Write a protein that binds this ligand. Structure first.
Ligand SMILES: Nc1nc2c(ncn2[C@@H]2O[C@H](COP(=O)(O)OP(=O)(O)OP(O)(O)=S)[C@@H](O)[C@H]2O)c(=O)[nH]1
Ligand SMILES: [Mg+2]
Length: 164
């Protein structure tokens, strides 16, 4: 049950993160997700292999009613925000709240501050994200689907958490 569901407001980088991990590519052009896609891939870690299942959800508000079914079903929830967007960060509380209401203590949550490459328009410090994650008892990491920074680390840490 290495099932990961990506949650987060529109345009924070959920699809880009999944695509960077899956095919190690990045398209700077925006193409909104209008359904729910799933992919899978086998990765290596801690002297073994693990089969991951990834769910990419639509962040636009008109698709929110389609998301609960996927949360109930996943063992890991990756809540993503955009470090250049204050609202996207504030909204992570809603997503984390939703996940815990549906999964309780039986879930691994990773808070992700994406788009670190956009340093000049950063609105949330890495320390504020790390502090929020600690206060809410969830994992934390910053990434850049564009440069690929920490993308493999994100999945490695989530997979490691599952194994433990
Ligand atoms: N500069 C930069 N742009 C990024 C990064 N990750 C994603 N993007 C860009 O941000 C835009 C939105 O990314 P995308 O992956 O579509 O968001 P999403 O969360 O999947 O959005 P949705 O499908 O719920 S509406 C795209 O134009 C994409 O190329 C990043 O790490 N750095
Ligand atoms: Mg998308």
């Amino acid at each position: 049950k290495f099932k990961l569901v990506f949650l987060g407001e529109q345009s924070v980088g959920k699809t880009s993160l999944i695509t960077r991990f899956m095919y190690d590519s990045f398209d700077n052009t925006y193409q909104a997700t209008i359904g729910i896609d799933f992919l899978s891939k086998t990765m290596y870690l801690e002297d073994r292999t693990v089969r991951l299942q990834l769910w990419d959800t639509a962040g636009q508000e008109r698709f929110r009613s389609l998301i609960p079914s996927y949360i109930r079903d996943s063992t890991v929830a990756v809540v993503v925000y955009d470090i250049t967007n204050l609202n996207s960060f504030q909204q992570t509380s809603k997503w984390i709240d939703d996940v815990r209401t549906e999964r309780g203590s039986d879930v691994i949550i990773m808070l992700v501050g994406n788009k670190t490459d956009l340093a000049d328009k950063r609105q949330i410090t890495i320390e504020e994200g790390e502090q929020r994650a600690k206060e809410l008892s969830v994992m934390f990491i910053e990434t850049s689907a564009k440069t690929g920074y920490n993308v493999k680390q994100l999945f490695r840490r989530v997979a490691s958490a599952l194994l433990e």
